[PDB]
A and B are shown apart, each in its own frame.
With several copies, the nearest count.
Chain A
Amino acid sequence: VPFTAIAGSEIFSLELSKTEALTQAFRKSIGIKIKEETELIEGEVVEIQIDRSITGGHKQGKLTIKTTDMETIYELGNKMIDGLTKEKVLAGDVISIDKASGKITKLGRSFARSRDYDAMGADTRFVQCPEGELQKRKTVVHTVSLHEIDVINSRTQGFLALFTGDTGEIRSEVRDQINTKVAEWKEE
């Protein structure tokens, strides 16, 4: 239950009017939690193979995601190759992938259940190993105020104004449509 503990002296500003400031405070005082049924593909992806775009099969990209529970391989649909390496990472990374995101998050390193070769080896392996199932639904809950939603409505990009703080006195029909949308979302 986030609060709004701010003295009324700083209501005056050179970027938000008194009405806009009061409306922002009132809409921030009332919050909404949102549950999104996002997905995952967890497990040690020991290899990341990216085959060429063959005509018969547009992507034969092998990648062997496997948790501690099971050993499994997968396939990339010519869209997720750069999702792994948006930042330059290697294989064996636990990937908290989301289907409607396109931004694959790598959690670092991971373990198999094999002893590898016969001579002395198995060196340099001490990290977190995948624990959960290969796939399971996650009803992730996110808490945001009306400020974020309104600044998203006003401009196509909203994180810049949320960080820097130059929202820009968003208009009323935005608040009306957000009222209707939140009412029907609660009803749904």
Chain B
Amino acid sequence: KALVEEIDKKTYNPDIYFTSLDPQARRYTSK
């Protein structure tokens, strides 16, 4: 990857990445 790239410890979970253009404005299922 881009070495030592911009990252602010925002999520970055290898098995969690949820984004959208907000036509429903929700997120991944959890509890």
Q: Do chains A and B touch in the complex (CB under 8 A)?
A: yes
Q: Is A47 an interface residue (CB 8 A)?
A: yes
* B28 / chain A contacts, CB cutoff of 8 Å: 49-51
The CA of A1 and the CA of B5, in the complex, are separated in Å by 39
The CA of A36 and the CA of B29, in the complex, are separated in Å by 39
* B17 / chain A contacts, CB cutoff of 8 Å: 48, 50, 81-82, 84-85
Q: Is A184 an interface residue (CB 8 A)?
A: no
The CA of A82 and the CA of B15, in the complex, are separated in Å by 7
Q: State which size class the interface on B falls in.
A: 10 to 19
| B contact patch SS | loop
Q: Mark B1-23, 1 if CB is under 8 A from A, else 0.
A: 11001110000001111111101
- Closest chain A residue, CB of each to CB of B16: A50
Residues 95 to 130 of chain A near chain B (Cβ within 8 Å): 109, 112, 114, 116, 125
Q: State which size class the interface on A falls in.
A: 20 to 34
Known contacts A53-B15, A81-B15, A82-B14; is-contact A88 B20 (Cβ 8 Å): no
- Closest chain B residue, CB of each to CB of A83: B17
Q: Is A92 an interface residue (CB 8 A)?
A: yes
A46, A81, A84, A114: the one within 8 Å of B20 (CB): A46
Q: When the two chains form their complex, are residues A92 and B21 in contact, meaning their CB atoms are under 8 A apart?
A: yes
A87, A90, A112: the one within 8 Å of B19 (CB): A90
B5, B14, B21, B23: the one within 8 Å of A87 (CB): B5
* A84 / chain B contacts, CB cutoff of 8 Å: 17
Known contacts A86-B1, A88-B7; is-contact A50 B18 (Cβ 8 Å): yes
* B18 / chain A contacts, CB cutoff of 8 Å: 47-50, 91
Q: From residue B1, how far is it (CB to closest CB) to chain A in Å?
A: 6
The CA of A50 and the CA of B20, in the complex, are separated in Å by 13
Residues of A within 8 A of B (CB): 46-53, 78, 81-82, 84-92, 109, 112, 114, 116, 125
